[PDB]
Amino acid sequence: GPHMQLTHQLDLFPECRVTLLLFKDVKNAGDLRRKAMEGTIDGSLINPTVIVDPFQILVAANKAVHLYKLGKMKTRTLSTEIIFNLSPNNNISEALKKFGISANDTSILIVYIEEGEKQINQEYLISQVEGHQVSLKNLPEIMNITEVKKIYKLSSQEESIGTLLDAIICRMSTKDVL
């Protein structure tokens, strides 16, 4: 029944597992955003319309765990750090608005990380979303290429030598040294 989640171990942090859950037709995104701010929902609530591939999330999560174990995160929590890492810029407040969720949203990607005794009650989490969980194969129907290209300011030079994903990844992975 529930087997729609996508889970990967972090190669560099073998004890850590990243989980992705995707939902359509969400009716309570306002509640979910308030709950994330009150710490009563686990995970990063991410806007899936600007996520082109799970690899994008896994790169963001790898970096967030890394800084998090160093005590050198740019934001206040692991969940906000994953979201901030998706953005092409170092503006924290801008990243959390464009890549996080609003009450205006009806699709949501929840990302969370488990390690050791830090475990998420996945059934309880899914029960909090007033919406329909779907397999991540559905992500191309939700992602909006126009919106992605605007956020990341991808140009035609970039597109001439690889994929939009590769240009996005390159932006994400080097923005800390501008």
Partner: protein
């Protein structure tokens, strides 16, 4: 008693050297080593400079940080300018390790040339390769990116080989400069590599220069500085 921040930093460096542990070596330079691995489902290479046993540990860390940072900036600059080079996945500044896309199945330009020289007996059929490298380095210099170490070992041909898909690598010595002298020295390093690693390919380097000159509108002062730095 130890500072938690220092402990966490040592645990990250231990994680890094554990990841590198069983990996195969695919390239080696004076300071750096490049290993082949996997990063979150993608073929990756990981580049690291191991501390040399005769240097102060803090000098080694400074060197590793400076070159890692410069290479990550250069690779971003390449991607945004449409210059083909590896995608950066992750840069670990705790251990100064750079995780990059593996250019799978590629051969270095060095090996491609020497192979052609041994099968053919003449550099005749390397003209298109020379013209392509001319176009690529022209674009790189027009972005004011000085590679710093242009040899035929730092250019890859991504398969299918005969498409001549050049991918530039190893920007650990790169920097940003608009000065024709810096671009001239860059070219001179490459000239010397050609002359000494591929003897009797002067016509190949000649076609490279002709292609460079028509590809960049700023080549004229650069080629004048090439003439000057060779003399000095």
């Amino acid at each position: 008693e130890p500072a938690p921040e220092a402990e966490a930093l040592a645990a990250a460096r231990e994680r890094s050297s554990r990841f590198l542990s069983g990996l195969e070596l695919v390239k080696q330079g004076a300071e750096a080593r490049v290993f082949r691995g996997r990063f979150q489902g993608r073929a990756a290479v990981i580049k690291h400079r191991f501390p040399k046993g005769y240097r102060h540990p803090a000098l080694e860390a400074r060197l590793g940080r400076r070159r890692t940072v410069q290479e990550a900036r250069a690779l971003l600059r390449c991607r945004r300018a449409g210059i083909s080079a590896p995608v950066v996945f992750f840069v670990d500044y705790a251990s100064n390790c750079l995780y990059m896309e593996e250019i799978e199945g590629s051969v270095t330009v060095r090996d491609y040339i020497q192979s052609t020289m041994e099968t053919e007996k003449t550099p005749q059929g390397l003209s298109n390769l020379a013209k392509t490298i001319g176009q690529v380095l022209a674009r790189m210099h027009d972005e004011d990116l000085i590679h710093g170490d242009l040899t035929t070992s730092n250019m890859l041909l991504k398969p299918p080989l005969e498409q001549l898909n050049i991918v530039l690598i190893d920007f650990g010595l790169s920097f940003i400069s608009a000065l024709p002298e810096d671009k001239g020295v860059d070219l001179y390093v490459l000239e010397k590599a050609f002359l000494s690693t591929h003897p009797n390919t002067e016509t190949v380097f000649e076609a490279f220069l002709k292609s460079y000159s028509t590809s960049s509108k700023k080549a004229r002062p650069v080629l004048k500085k090439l003439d000057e730095v060779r003399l000095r």
